[PDB]
Swiss-Prot record:
Protein name, per record: Cyclin-dependent kinase 2
Record-listed Phosphothreonine modification sites: T14, T152
Taxonomy of the source species: Eukaryota, Metazoa, Chordata, Craniata, Vertebrata
Induction profile: Induced transiently by TGFB1 at an early phase of TGFB1-mediated apoptosis.
Annotated GO biological process: cell division; cellular response to nitric oxide; cellular senescence; centriole replication; centrosome duplication; chromatin remodeling; DNA repair; DNA replication
Matches recorded under CDD domains: STKc_CDK2_3
Biological role: Serine/threonine-protein kinase involved in the control of the cell cycle; essential for meiosis, but dispensable for mitosis. Phosphorylates CABLES1, CTNNB1, CDK2AP2, ERCC6, NBN, USP37, p53/TP53, NPM1, CDK7, RB1, BRCA2, MYC, NPAT, EZH2. Triggers duplication of centrosomes and DNA.
UniProt catalytic activity: L-seryl-[protein] + ATP = O-phospho-L-seryl-[protein] + ADP + H(+); L-threonyl-[protein] + ATP = O-phospho-L-threonyl-[protein] + ADP + H(+)
Amino acid sequence: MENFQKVEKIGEGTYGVVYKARNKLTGEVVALKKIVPSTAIREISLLKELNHPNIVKLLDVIHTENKLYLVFEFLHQDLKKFMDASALTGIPLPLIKSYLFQLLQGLAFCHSHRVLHRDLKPQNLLINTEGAIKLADFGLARAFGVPVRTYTHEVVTLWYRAPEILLGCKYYSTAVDIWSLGCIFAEMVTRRALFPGDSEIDQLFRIFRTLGTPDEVVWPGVTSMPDYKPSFPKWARQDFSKVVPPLDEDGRSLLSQMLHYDPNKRISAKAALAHPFFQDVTKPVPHLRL
Ligand SMILES: Brc1cnn2c(NCc3ccncc3)cc(-c3ccccc3)nc12
C-alpha cells in the first residue's frame, strides 16, 4: 500500500472503505478498496482475467499483513448519484436504453464464464463522460459472501434481490443478476425504486403485490422452496402499464421477461440483447458535472 496516495473517500463499500488514490509511481488514478482465507485469494485472483469494457477493471490484488486491497480502474460517477441528479427531468429514454444494453453485454460476458455478481445495485454501476457504464464488484460475493450489514453497519439493500434468494434457494443462478438489472431498469424509467423493501418479508411482499403471489402455475416448485409459507397472502398481478409508465411496449415486454418468477424462464442476458427493444439503440453522451 505504500505505493498509493489516498486522495479522498469515494464510497463506503460492502466490505470496506473505497478510496480514490494515486499510484505514487505511475501517477495512475485508481479506486482502492480495503476488504485471508486462501479460497478467497484464489477466487479474487481469477477475476483479474475477467475483462470486458462494461466491467470495471480489477488492476491488482494486494495481500499484506493479512490485509486485502483491491485496486480498480477509477470512474467519476455512479448511477445512484446520476439518477439523484437527473430526478427533476429523468434520464432520457435513449440513454436508459444504452445503459441497459451495455449492462446486458457485461452480464452476458460474466455469465458466459459462470461468474455471478449477486448484488447489483445503482451504487455499483459506474459511468464516465463517454457514455459508458460499467459493473463494479462482479464476483466478490462468491469470494467474500454478502453480509446483512456493511463494515460500517449500514444495511445492505434488499431492493434488488431476486425472489429465489429471498425464498431460500441455495444454488441460485445467473438469473439473479437479470432480476436485479430489471429492477434498476424500472427505477431509471420511473425515478422511484421498484421494490424498496425494508426487511426480507417486506421485500417479498412488495414483489408479490406487484407481480402477484407466485404459485405452482407461474413457478413450478415454488411451494417447496425453503422459506415459502402456505400462509403468504395471495395478491393479484398488476399490469406493467401501471408499474412503469410511460415505458413503451417493447420496454414493458423486456422488463416482464427480466422479472419472470421462475429463474429458468427468466430471460438470459444474451437473449435480452436480441430483444426488439434494442432495435434502435444508440450511445448518447450523458451530461456529467464533475
Ligand atoms: Br471500484 C470503483 C471505481 N470508481 N468508483 C466510484 N466512482 C464514483 C465516485 C464517487 C464519488 N467520488 C468520486 C467518484 C465509486 C465507487 C463506490 C463504492 C462504494 C460506494 C459508492 C461508490 N466505487 C468505484
